Design an enzyme around this catalytic site. Structure first.
Site, PDB file in Angstrom:
ATOM      1  N   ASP A   1       2.262  -0.868   1.840  1.00 43.21           N
ATOM      2  CA  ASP A   1       1.727   0.263   2.597  1.00 43.21           C
ATOM      3  C   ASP A   1       2.844   1.236   2.993  1.00 43.21           C
ATOM      4  OD1 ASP A   1       2.927  -1.402   4.477  1.00 43.21           O
ATOM      5  OD2 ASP A   1       1.284  -1.287   5.925  1.00 43.21           O
TER       6      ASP A   1
ATOM      7  N   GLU B   1      -8.595   4.082   3.291  1.00 46.97           N
ATOM      8  CA  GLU B   1      -7.647   3.000   3.010  1.00 46.97           C
ATOM      9  C   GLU B   1      -7.317   2.860   1.526  1.00 46.97           C
ATOM     10  OE1 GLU B   1      -6.186   1.013   5.339  1.00 46.97           O
ATOM     11  OE2 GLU B   1      -7.378   1.432   7.130  1.00 46.97           O
TER      12      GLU B   1
END
Ligand SMILES: [Mn+2]
Ligand SMILES: [Mn+2]
EC number: 3.2.1.17
Lengths: 77, 241
Positions: free
Chosen positions: B99, B90
């Site tokens: 993102d 992540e």
């Protein structure tokens, strides 16, 4: 069956620093042990429960094992 | 039971020198101990784990044994070791970013909201956090969010009849691989892998690996999926070393 003072009939996990000091003083008289210094267990009940039998023996060479087993019986009841 | 600050819920091996100092300050209050000098353990977590009980007693004559046993209890009731796993998968970010989708994220892949634009946006949270972060968090606040998410994932797994019996049978390492997927696509998403979850429960590692690699999840994020699958197949950290 072991009958301790009213203020200590509470589960050991809720005992304050002062409660374990009173427990020490009570146990000394109830069991005719060598004098236990008040500063032998400077901690609350939560900390008292973390300690191994070896730790009790180290902190109290004369009565540590007895004190530990006393605690196990209190917890057992 | 011991309830320590969220950021210290990470296994001690990840603890910095400041972390052990914070653990000391917390332990002193939680256990009504004699004051603990902040210089008692001038070292990080890796070093703290090398010390003996005699070393603890020598450094803290009043509380050493308690501190040592406290540490043993913390190690006993870990916790799959998934911090570095998800750090790699992540990333670790201290300031709000977007993102692959377009949703605002911070820390270790923590979704804030699906709300767009740059007109604040979000601005929360920001408590969660927090306190008024104004978009920037600490390492520790990222660790807090991370642990709160792991706990949300675990409870998500434990509240699911398709996931709970699978998670229960899995070994500590493979449990992290399952949480990794739940962290990425949610409870309902991972629950959709009906046949594959049955394979993992029956310890068919090679079969489950091949089956999972044919998925939409694998196509979307190949590199990460490969690593998670390898973890399920071998039961080690070979893909993350
Ligand atoms: Mn993500
Ligand atoms: Mn930290």
């Amino acid at each position: 069956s072991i009958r301790l003072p009213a203020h200590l009939r509470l589960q050991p996990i809720y005992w304050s620093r002062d409660d374990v000091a009173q427990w020490l003083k009570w146990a000394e008289n109830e069991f005719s042990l060598r004098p236990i210094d008040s500063n032998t267990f400077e901690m609350n009940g939560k900390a008292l429960l973390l300690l191994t039998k070896e730790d009790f023996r180290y902190r109290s060479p004369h009565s540590g094992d007895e004190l530990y087993e006393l605690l196990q019986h209190i917890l057992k009841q | 039971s011991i309830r320590l600050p969220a950021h210290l819920r990470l296994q001690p091996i990840y603890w910095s020198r400041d972390d052990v100092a914070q653990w000391l300050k917390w332990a002193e209050n939680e256990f009504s101990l004699r004051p603990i000098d902040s210089n008692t353990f001038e070292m990080n977590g890796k070093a703290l784990l090398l010390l003996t009980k005699e070393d603890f007693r020598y450094r803290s004559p009043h509380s050493g044994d308690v501190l040592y046993e406290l540490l043993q209890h913390i190690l006993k009731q870990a916790g799959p070791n998934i911090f570095e796993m998800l750090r790699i998968d992540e990333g670790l970010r201290l300031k709000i970013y977007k993102d692959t989708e377009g949703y605002y994220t911070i820390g270790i892949g923590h979704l804030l909201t699906k709300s767009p634009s740059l007109n604040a946006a979000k601005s929360e949270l920001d408590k969660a956090i927090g306190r008024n972060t104004n978009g920037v968090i600490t390492k520790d606040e990222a660790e807090k969010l991370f642990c709160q998410d792991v706990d949300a994932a675990v409870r998500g797994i434990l509240r699911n009849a398709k996931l709970k019996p699978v998670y229960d049978s899995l070994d500590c390492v493979r449990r992290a691989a399952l949480i990794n997927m739940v962290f990425q696509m949610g409870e309902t998403g991972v629950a959709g892998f009906t046949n594959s979850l049955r394979m993992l429960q029956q310890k068919r590692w090679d079969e489950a690996a091949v089956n999972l690699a044919k998925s939409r999840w694998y196509n979307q994020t190949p590199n990460r999926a490969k690593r998670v699958i390898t973890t399920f197949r071998t039961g080690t950290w070979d893909a993350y070393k």
